[PDB]
């Protein structure tokens, strides 16, 4: 599904803290907050070159 991986709103924290400069989920009180969201290396993220149906 083309919506897989992009169901989240995540902005990289950037330079200034010991994180790895990767799009991280918005703040909250869950375990999901602060985790990698978009990259193919991230758990629950988008896959590299999603298999298109065409």
């Amino acid at each position: 599904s083309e919506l897989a991986g992009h169901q989240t709103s995540a902005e990289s924290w950037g330079t200034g803290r010991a994180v790895a400069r990767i799009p991280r989920v918005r703040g909250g009180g869950t375990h999901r907050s602060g985790q990698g969201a978009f990259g193919n290396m991230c758990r629950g993220g988008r896959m590299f070159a999603p298999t298109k149906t065409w």
């Binding site: 924290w13 200034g16 803290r17 010991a18 994180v19 991280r24 703040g27 909250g28 009180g29 869950t30 375990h31 999901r32 907050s33 602060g34 985790q35």
Partner: peptide
Amino acid sequence: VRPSVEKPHPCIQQPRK
């Protein structure tokens, strides 16, 4: 429950002579 990581929350340093 808590997030995995949280956002963490000044020498000028110019020698002259």
